[PDB]
Write a protein that binds this ligand. Structure first.
Ligand SMILES: Nc1nc2c(ncn2[C@@H]2O[C@H](COP(=O)(O)OP(=O)(O)O)[C@@H](O)[C@H]2O)c(=O)[nH]1
Ligand SMILES: Nc1nc2c(ncn2[C@@H]2O[C@H](COP(=O)(O)OP(=O)(O)O)[C@@H](O)[C@H]2O)c(=O)[nH]1
Ligand SMILES: O=c1nc2n(C[C@H](O)[C@H](O)[C@H](O)CO)c3cc(O)ccc3cc-2c(=O)[nH]1
Ligand SMILES: [Ca+2]
Ligand SMILES: [Ca+2]
Ligand SMILES: [Ca+2]
Ligand SMILES: [Ca+2]
Lengths: 320, 326
């Protein structure tokens, strides 16, 4: 009755919604449920900005599961304004509702509360119906090393600045996980991975959403050691118009945007890797030595479809 | 050439506007500027709230002179929204009694981040003023902390408590029994950069008709500042903030009562005193129809309503004239 999912980004929040729907948790609860959902949430995008601490993935899971996301925009609060952002532009340097979260979190961190407890405190308001554990209570911020065009020097940029400003506009060389080597697995993270009935890798971006969770010392070891089946979900959805575009962050590490490539990225637990099973969308193929591969529908069209997706993860692992 | 004015918030900014219109400064600039206006701004109301630093007096002048102030509120931005404040309420956090506007919050965020990175307030203020272009030099009385505290009888328990000015003013609206003010940090605060010099090199120094106990007073509590006023060669002209028989914006009467000073122009004048003896004033202007005696102080009844920048401009002229300054 214990399921733990590693997540990052909007897609992670959507996958958790499916988990909740299948198991009657959170918004989808009819009576008190038989299951506990634990999310090990990416902190690689977290940043100090404008004197306040911003944790996008933890916030996106919290708001999404708490039913606070705007149905028509898909991101951000309902009836959001960006007046504070507007004045910040005028000052020459982030919704208003979003800022309140930031002020509260910042006040807690500066008063000594670790992020895990900041998160629990915010979740008393949102009541996501899930345990959202930050991968780490220490800093571990995903950066991108570019060739800077002012002087030609390699520089590390915060992933967030890279994504808006520099992506596809200057040469990019690698990712750096700033602070990761000095970070420890956040409270409960190794325990949540060790005691689970099943561990699911959400179909988030493998490099910058699941990937940085894996750079936290202790987390990768937990995954290799745990007796819970580990089932990963492919993030590659073929069949789009013009056959889609390759993933920009997989490009940075020279990894093809195929279910086969992302699968080899995580690799087989039978070997040095992390996966016992690997789900791909129907019509897609992957053969990976040691890894059970199955094509099923993998579109998170709504919680009902994601619930089917989660159900197929249990079945491949053989978990009830 | 050089005018230095001690100011609070809404009233100091309003008086400062009069200075600007009289001299063709800031928003009122019509051709080459012949004058330099320096404001020494009260920092006694400054407070940390929700993890961000609030400087209401500096902000209100900054917003007012820069054409951003809320016309009917007198504090905070025009067309302000309060969604961020609303969300703080929804999270159930404290204090829920202090209005952090969404537009206003950006100032607080930029200011808080710069101070935390070691920038002194004076530099934060100049930086913020590059966007607003107030047309005046807004000097914090000090780059160090000097916050007015209020000794009340707390209505929860009947106990004596000290509260920050913000809680006295915003939460209780000065309606709790009030016993004294403490200028916590003033004796340890150094006069801000340029403040003593602006007082010394001024052709004239003007005390805006701001709140005497909680707006001008706390400036005068910074050790360096009071000496500059006494030791300066520029005449010091004060404006009574009390228009006897006419209630005015703010709680000046309540603040005067705490320090046991009658709400009359003569009493406020004597509060500040005469430079001939132990005081600070050379001159002291009051509203027409008001009589005031101050030994050592030239007192002149003149119109004293800040109804508009043109009317205030005349008020400024009457100080120059009483000082004998051109
Ligand atoms: N398999 C699968 N992957 C998806 C679906 N929707 C989105 N994704 C993947 O989710 C990734 C983006 O999600 P995420 O890592 O959470 O970061 P985000 O950019 O903030 O949304 C994309 O690279 C997609 O490949 C879906 O329905 N199925
Ligand atoms: N003489 C005079 N004083 C005024 C007038 N309008 C407001 N005041 C005074 O100015 C004070 C407010 O200025 P200040 O203390 O800087 O504003 P605050 O800090 O925002 O309260 C009030 O307490 C009033 O007594 C006016 O027209 N004439
Ligand atoms: O009465 C109020 N005055 C508010 N003021 C005015 C200020 O608190 C006091 O009027 C001054 O301290 C005294 O003049 C603010 C000033 C700021 O710079 C920033 C925020 C506020 C918020 C309030 C408020 O919520 N209620
Ligand atoms: Ca298609
Ligand atoms: Ca004030
Ligand atoms: Ca000091
Ligand atoms: Ca004293």
């Amino acid at each position: 009755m214990k399921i733990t999912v590693l997540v990052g980004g909007v897609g992670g929040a959507r996958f958790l919604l499916g988990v909740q729907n299948l198991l009657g948790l959170g918004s989808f609860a009819d009576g008190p449920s038989k299951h506990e959902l634990t999310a090990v949430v990416n902190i690689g995008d977290d940043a100090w900005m404008h004197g306040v601490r911003i944790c996008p993935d933890l916030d996106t899971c919290m708001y999404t599961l708490g039913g606070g996301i705007d149905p028509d925009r898909g991101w951000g609060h309902r009836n959001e304004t960006w007046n504070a952002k507007e004045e910040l532009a005028a000052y020459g340097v982030l919704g208003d509702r979003d800022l309140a979260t930031h002020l509260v979190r910042s006040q807690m961190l500066r008063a000594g509360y670790p992020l895990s407890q900041v998160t629990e405190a915010l979740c008393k308001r949102w009541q996501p119906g899930a345990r959202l554990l930050p991968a780490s209570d220490e800093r571990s911020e995903t950066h991108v090393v570019i060739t800077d065009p002012t002087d030609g020097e390699r520089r590390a940029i915060h992933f967030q600045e890279w994504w808006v400003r520099y992506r596809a506009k200057v040469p990019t060389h690698s990712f750096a996980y700033v602070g990761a080597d000095q970070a420890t697995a956040g409270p409960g993270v190794v325990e949540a991975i060790g005691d689970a009935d099943i561990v699911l890798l959400a179909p988030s971006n493998p490099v910058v959403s699941i990937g940085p969770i894996l750079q936290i010392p202790g987390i990768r070891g937990a995954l290799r050691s745990t007796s819970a089946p580990v089932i990963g979900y492919s993030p590659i959805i073929a069949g789009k118009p013009l056959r889609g575009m390759a993933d920009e962050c997989l490009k940075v590490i020279g990894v093809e945007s195929t279910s086969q490539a992302v699968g080899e990225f995580f690799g087989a637990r039978a070997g040095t890797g992390l996966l016992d099973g690997w789900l791909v969308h129907e019509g897609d193929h992957a053969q990976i030595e040691g890894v059970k591969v199955k094509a099923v529908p993998l579109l998170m069209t709504d919680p009902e479809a994601t619930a089917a997706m989660v159900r197929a993860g249990l079945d491949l692992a053989g978990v009830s």
